[PDB]
Symmetry: C2
Subunit: 199 residues, 2 copies
């Protein structure tokens, strides 16, 4: 009865918007919940911390939300949508040198999603879209902790390029439902609503 | 070369005394750094205070401590070992193994969780029954809620919780002996005799 739906994609993929668009629409049919913080003070108090410790910090926060929101609502048959799930950690942590199989074991208390949508779009195209909207490129998005002194536009191409690599390597094993993010937001959402329409 | 010596044991087992006494001896011949597992640092404190309102699950409790330990390890413990120090740990990862697993977190997952830390060259388990440790505790001092497993057994007298809670910790340590190669020291012996035995095992190694 409980169903877990996850979205993954690089920054700029529109995956958060797709996740919220799907919530609003599923709410018409049945019980759904969207994953919605001290991490603030920790990062702010650093100033370094190793990537290992960073991986633990994010896993601690993930465990908290998982056992206090995600898992209980699944037990009450909510659909739960999460627009980042453990695969985001797999990528975030392993591009910074942490043994991905170690990260997988770390997160092995979490269940596999019934569906995972990989909204796949290249970094080139993600950037030109961020630029057409005139938004500012967050340092986290540029991977500036790994590439200081690249511009923000080129960090984004490099870091999100490394992140894409990891997502592509997980596609087979993790049964990602690969979606073409070059399509428009409407075309993407309608295809997502159609896929979810099935299970 | 750097060497890592861990002390394990239940509350009231004397292990901290034994750690400190070892430190005072070894610091006469060479460089030595004593750290205590229970002395959590900045990251732990920020998380616990920030979540003071919420009830944390055991898994989360366990990650908070591993996270904080990962920082202390890369910042203090590994550099002291690389710099040639002898490192003495009064409580080490095995304490988390026991703590987190009597609260329901799967011990095999905790082992994986801490897989990043190196095994001690020597681990001393100063074995003392919970009754005997209770008796020393009385004959001195009140028992802290954490020593009594207060969260797990809020319906018990401090004394009785210490016996049930420390009993469980003892089971976990006993089941690690073989795998973790603990050197099991009979903690009913006098403190002077315990230290003499520890000093001889350490002597054998580092000489
Ligand atoms: Ni603590």
């Amino acid at each position: 009865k409980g169903v877990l739906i996850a979205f993954e994609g690089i920054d700029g993929s529109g995956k958060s918007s797709q996740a919220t668009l799907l919530k609003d629409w599923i709410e018409l049919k049945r019980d759904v919940y969207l994953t919605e913080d001290w991490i603030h003070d920790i990062i702010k108090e650093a100033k370094l911390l190793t990537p290992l410790t960073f991986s633990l910090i994010h896993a601690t926060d993930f465990s908290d939300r998982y056992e206090r929101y995600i898992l209980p609502m699944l037990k009450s048959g909510f659909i739960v949508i999460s627009d980042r799930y453990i695969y985001t950690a797999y990528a975030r942590d392993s591009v910074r040198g942490v043994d991905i199989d170690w990260v997988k074991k770390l997160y092995s208390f979490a269940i596999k999603p019934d569906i995972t949508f990989y909204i796949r779009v290249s970094p080139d195209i993600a950037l030109e879209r961020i630029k057409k909207s005139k938004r500012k490129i967050k340092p986290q998005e540029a991977g500036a902790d790994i590439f200081p002194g690249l511009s923000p536009e080129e960090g984004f191409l490099k870091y999100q390029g490394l992140i894409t690599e990891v997502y592509d390597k997980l596609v087979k094993d993790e049964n990602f439902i690969v979606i073409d993010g070059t399509k428009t937001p409407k075309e993407i959402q309608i295809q997502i609503r159609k896929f979810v329409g099935e299970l």
